[PDB]
Amino acid sequence: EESMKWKKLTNAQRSGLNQIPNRRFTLWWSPTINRANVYVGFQVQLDL
RNA sequence: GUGCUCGCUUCGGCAGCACAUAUACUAAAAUUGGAACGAUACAGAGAAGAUUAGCAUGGCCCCUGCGCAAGGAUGACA
Numbered sequence: 649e650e651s652m653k654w655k656k657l658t659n660a661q662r663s664g665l666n667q668i669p670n671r672r673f674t675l676w677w678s679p680t681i682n683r684a685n686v687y688v689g690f691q692v693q694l695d696l
Numbered sequence: 697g698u699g700c701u702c703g704c705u706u707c708g709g710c711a712g713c714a715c716a717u718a719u720a721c722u723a724a725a726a727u728u729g730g731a732a733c734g735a736u737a738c739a740g741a742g743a744a745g746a747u748u749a750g751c752a753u754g755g756c757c758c759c760u761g762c763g764c765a766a767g768g769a770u771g772a773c774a
Contacts, residue, residue, distance in 0.1 A: 667742085
């Protein structure tokens with residue numbers, strides 16, 4: 649992600665690269681955000 | 697069918713008369729065909745650059761060598 653910070657990327661490529669911090673934050677707090685206490689509703693299993 | 701004709705005619709009947717005027721995708725049944733993104737089976741990183749190593753070229757500035765052209769200043773008695 650650091651090496652790609654300056655490599656002449658298109659706007660759509662950079663927009664899809666400023667999401668890694670959000671993905672890492674969501675994964676760090678995943679045992680709390682994905683809880684079924686928060687987000688009441690049906691649960692879905694990843695098929696692997 | 698109902699009721700009526702001063703009709704034939706008998707109450708057993710007959711001839712005529714008024715009203716009735718055109719429903720239905722019509723259908724109960726006939727058959728043989730073509731068929732999932734529903735399951736199981738497979739795969740499943742389901743969103744990234746699709747790369748980095750040398751050398752040479754190209755630009756600028758010196759230094760050295762060779763060539764071409766045009767030149768400058770200087771040196772040498774018997």
